[PDB]
Ligand binder design. Structure first.
Ligand SMILES: Cc1ccccc1NC(=O)c1cncc(C(N)=O)c1
Ligand SMILES: [Zn+2]
Length: 139
């Protein structure tokens, strides 16, 4: 689990969105596993505006943060796992690292701010849905 709070927006994994998220929907993309809902409280996170390919992410299944190198956002085929099916997903970045389903929502951050959130995993890789291209989250 986990979310990004920037301005009056909440960014969450689309597959983890609640009834309140869908009732206050701002934007969603089923090809990216992202959904953004509106909030009454003002959030203070900052979204990175950059092309970094190194950062740190939080892994709840290890209660640890790990430094990683990651690929630029692209269209990737995600392999089938014990509990979830295989799929194609866009704007996804991969790194070598540990990820289990419940790790979705963990934030990847660089020196500039939030880069993305854990969205895929298995086979020794971790995949993050990028948010740096969503410029409208800044206004
Ligand atoms: C994160 C992870 C790690 C290991 C194994 C599997 C996963 N995948 C998920 O929990 C997951 C569940 N629902 C949807 C998606 C998606 N990106 O569409 C991903
Ligand atoms: Zn950066």
């Amino acid at each position: 689990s986990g979310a990004i709070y920037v301005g009056n927006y909440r960014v969450v994994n689309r597959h983890l969105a609640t009834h309140n998220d869908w009732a206050n929907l701002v934007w969603e993309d089923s090809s990216r596993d992202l959904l953004v809902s509106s909030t009454t409280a003002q959030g203070c996170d900052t979204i990175a505006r950059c092309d970094c390919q190194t950062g740190v992410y939080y892994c709840s299944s290890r209660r640890k943060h790990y430094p990683v190198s990651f690929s630029k956002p692209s269209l990737i085929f995600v392999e089938a796992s014990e509990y979830y099916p295989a799929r194609y997903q866009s704007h996804l970045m991969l790194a070598v690292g540990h990820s289990e389903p419940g790790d979705c929502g963990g934030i990847l951050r660089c020196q500039h701010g939030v880069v993305g959130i854990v969205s895929t995993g298995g086979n020794g890789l971790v995949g993050f849905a990028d948010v740096r291209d969503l410029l409208w989250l800044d206004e």
